[PDB]
């Protein structure tokens, strides 16, 4: 028996179904085509012209020898390219593996070299910036080219990655983390129970696809056809111009960090949703925020359990921790032997659920070090144990209580 030092989010077996990223998004555009998924300043694609087009540089993509289970590397500047190119090797079958629009190119081909990726997606100015880069490198253009035949698309699989993340901004060895179509379809469907994100809502797209934040701007929305406002590099550096923006446009959704909404000189009253992650929100800003009118959130989680792995709904007054448990998701502590502690002791917070990622690419010594076997596992997802390294304690209302690094 005995629950206190294990803590599990919600049970909602399903929310793990027998899917693929493709699937979440071919199902969002065939029942709402005519639906606007992006704009970019001025410009609007619908989910049918979006997934028509995309469909065009999967077949693309496959002619040139990308299937299911391949990475593939992606770097186009902020907007609806470099959207569609994300979708584009989505659609292919393949995982993509995202570069932030200042990732050095030398660090472009480090990371491709250690994720043996078969090429990666530029535009055509960026494409002279790649010459250090060996790998193949083909142009969104190139790649939208009309086509002579129509390119079966072979389809991948849950067990397959869906994307590879390569810590934005590092300098030391390349620690690739690899992100499974499953973790991510569940993530996707765990966390918006919660959130909530429909589709009438008008959602910011502030963050560089290298972060996982941007897949809750980007995935939650298109799980349910929410529309995406993509911001220009402009716009990301200036906070005033920013609140006023999500005034003048509407947007009911912002997923950010606390510090730049602390910098918000004004209220936004029609927020519907606000989803803070990165760091745990200070609570001057929860009193400043925490209105009536908006929903506010706290998102904690590493990369290595897809996006996020806690939530909390933060409320004017009441302390701000990390919230429970995500639906499916669970955590425990550990002491240096990897063994359970009881409820109060201090020790390792490590997580386990179905989205915990398959490990570090081709790095078996670290991924063993940091993916354990969870003795307690009381179902088949929940067998991997992800050790954060942050220390933690569960108090005595069964909630669960950072306290650093270890
Ligand atoms: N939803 C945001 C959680 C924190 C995020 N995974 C990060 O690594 O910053």
Same mark, same amino acid.
């Given at each position: ?62 002619? %040139? ?18 959207? %569609? ?46 010459? +250090? ?21 072979? %389809? ?30 569940? $993530?996707?469907?765990? +966390? ?14 502030? $963050? ?55 910098? $918000? ?71 240096? +032997? ?32 940091? $993916? ?8 088949? +997802? ?25």
């Amino acid at each position: 028996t005995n629950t206190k030092n294990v803590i599990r989010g919600k049970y909602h077996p399903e929310f793990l179904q027998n899917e693929v990223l493709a699937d979440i998004f071919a199902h969002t555009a065939q029942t709402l085509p005519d639906k606007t998924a992006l704009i970019e300043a001025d410009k609007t694609l619908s989910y049918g012209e979006l997934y028509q087009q995309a469909l065009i540089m999967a077949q693309h993509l496959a002619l %040139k020898g990308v299937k299911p289970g391949h990475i593939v590397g992606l770097w186009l500047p902020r907007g609806i390219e470099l959207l %569609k190119a994300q979708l584009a090797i989505c659609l292919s079958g393949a995982a993509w593996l995202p570069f932030d629009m200042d990732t050095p190119a030398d660090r472009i081909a480090v990371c491709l070299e250690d994720a043996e990726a078969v090429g990666m997606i530029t535009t055509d100015e960026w494409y002279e910036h790649l010459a +250090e880069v060996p790998q193949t490198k083909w142009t969104n253009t190139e790649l939208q080219k009309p086509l002579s035949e129509s390119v079966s698309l072979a %389809k991948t699989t849950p067990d397959q990655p869906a994307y590879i993340i390569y810590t934005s901004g590092s300098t030391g060895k390349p620690k690739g983390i690899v992100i499974t179509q499953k973790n991510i379809c569940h $993530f996707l469907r765990s +966390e918006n129970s919660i959130l909530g994100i429909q589709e009438q809502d008008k959602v910011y797209q502030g $963050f560089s696809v290298a972060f996982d934040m941007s897949f809750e701007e980007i995935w939650l929305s298109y799980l349910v056809g929410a529309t995406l406002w993509i911001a220009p590099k402009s716009l990301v550096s200036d906070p005033e111009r920013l609140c006023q923006t999500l005034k003048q446009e509407q947007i009911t959704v912002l997923h950010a960090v606390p510090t730049l909404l602390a910098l $918000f000189p004004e209220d936004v009253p029609n927020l519907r949703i606000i989803n803070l992650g990165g760091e745990m929100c200070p609570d001057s800003l929860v009193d400043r925020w925490a209105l009536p009118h908006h929903q506010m959130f706290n998102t904690y989680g590493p990369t290595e359990t897809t996006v996020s792995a806690s939530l909390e709904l933060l409320e004017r007054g009441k302390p701000v921790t990390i919230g429970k448990p995500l639906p499916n998701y669970g955590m425990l502590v550990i002491n240096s +032997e990897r063994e359970l502690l009881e409820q109060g002791e201090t020790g390792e917070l490590c997580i386990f659920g179905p989205s915990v990622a398959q490990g570090y690419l081709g790095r078996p010594d670290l991924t063993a070090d940091k $993916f354990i076997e969870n003795p307690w596992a009381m179902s088949v +997802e929940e067998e991997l144990l992800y050790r954060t390294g942050d220390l933690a304690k569960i108090d005595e209302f069964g909630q669960v209580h950072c306290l650093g690094r270890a």
